[model samples]
Target: STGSATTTPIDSLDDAYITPVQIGTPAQTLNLDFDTGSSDLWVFSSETTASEVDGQTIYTPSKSTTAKLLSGATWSISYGDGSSSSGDVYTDTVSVGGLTVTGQAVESAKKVSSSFTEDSTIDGLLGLAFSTLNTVSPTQQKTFFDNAKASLDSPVFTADLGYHAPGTYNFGFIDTTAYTGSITYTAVSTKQGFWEWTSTGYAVGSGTFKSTSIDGIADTGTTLLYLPATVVSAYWAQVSGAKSSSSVGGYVFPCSATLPSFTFGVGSARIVIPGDYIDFGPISTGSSSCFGGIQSSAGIGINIFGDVALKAAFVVFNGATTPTLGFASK
Candidate 1:
């Protein structure tokens, strides 16, 4: 009733975390981003725009005997700065690791944005967020987790992301051996169809614990941590040459600058991020400036505790009617 899968970072900077998913009968295995931000299990398929099928693999529904078209249903999804994909829907037996879900919705993309085509490492996205965010219309479909939870030992999934290595996504059970201590549970606000939670507070490096309750969603789909400008500004102020840039996009700082570690609270438990993790990556091929892992989410009106934060601790996504989130130090 439980299953597990491996998630590996596409790049040294942890650009995206991908997990292998088998779709349809006879199983066509494709590496997909296990996105916790959006709710749409879409893929690049035979129906995808030929021109948009850059370096990714395609899933041809015709090749699967169990693939059934969900007549009249269609979907479209957008992520990041407008990278999007849209197409019709199909139902098939889908598997992740060893767990199988019968008649899970598999959206076949007929069109994908140029940004999506640019990324050759990921072929699709397996949404782990709430199903209310699903883009399918006429008849909205349940996410793979939703469909399988009934058969699972427990309706919960856990994430254990690594620093520079591969991690594990476990379903139906929590792996106690993965963390140093018991998990701290907290209430989640699913009002907006997200695993949104209010963090107790944060501290810049080794400073005072500012007891402000910051609200944000834990989005594995996002690569960076975004917070309010006041907090973001305080963190950047510690680094001498740091500045928010328009041309390069986001906060950039000298590659040689010393980035202090970031820490956030979860029910009195503080998870600390290594300072080096904040030094995202070089702005350009040989540029001395590097993008910061923590930036201001003020522009978009959403604070995102993305991969940068998620990777620092073990997280549990409980899908009970009264959902809650659990965090533990790893």
Candidate 2:
């Protein structure tokens, strides 16, 4: 029951899947998404008119005994995948296991896109990645975390999931003991709510990125490492027996021999990406079509260092006191 499933049948638009979670002292129940891309908390509402919305799981207060409204304020959200949803905010009692927090923030999407509505397996996303890019604005008053942070045992929160064999994501105070008990912290930028990074250049096998002007945001919400066209092409050229393969409309290389170890410099921090993670896919079951771990998103403004890149090291999005991000190796 803790795993995800898609074989279940849908009876109607209201037939959306929801994962049960408890919040606050008395153990208030709530639904959430086990998302890795973001770290925000929101919920749905009952006052929504089904006619004005499209293809989304709408929540009705009358349906849940614990649901409550937040002055009838409306909220809308848009994802990087071009999906959008609109709903109202509400305050409610919250809890998870024995951990309990009150006055939590939740949203109800009145309108949802087909991409989200059709996912019979998942209802909504509960971002547990980091607190830097949270969609919850101060103008909206308070966020779910803001309301509960005061009550947590530590300024930290931990999320233990069954992803790829029960992985855990933790927040608040850094667990220095986890990754050799030491952390490599990077300074923050005030202009954008992203972790700024600098590279000394990239080295794949024996090749290096032509330019060292690499600057971008380090994000966990994404699955792939996005780079400029020139950087991607140059890095692929270094693989001794490298060949391009297709994936998600992007390219990846398949080669092991010359797929030397690659490293990215972030001030005093050294972020490395092993060749195995770069060995993309064989395309077909037996085909030898190799794909590159890095993709070419030429015109894209933000070059995000996604999960594929981050899995190589233990990362810390230290936004509790300051907005700095920390990195280390196990």
By lDDT, the best candidate is 1
After superposition, candidate 2 runs with Cα above 4 Å error: 1-40, 43-66, 96-99, 118-121, 128-143, 150-163, 196-201, 206-213, 240-248, 254-261, 279-291
278-322 per-residue lDDT for model 2 (tens digits) = 655555567655656677766567676665566666666544555
lDDT of 1: 0.91
Clashes of each: 0, 24
Lowest-lDDT window of 10 residues in candidate 1? 76-85
lDDT (Cα) of model 2? 0.53
Which 10 consecutive residues of model 2 have the lowest summed lDDT? 1-10
Model 1 residue 157 CA deviation (Å) reads 0.5
Best by TM-score: 1
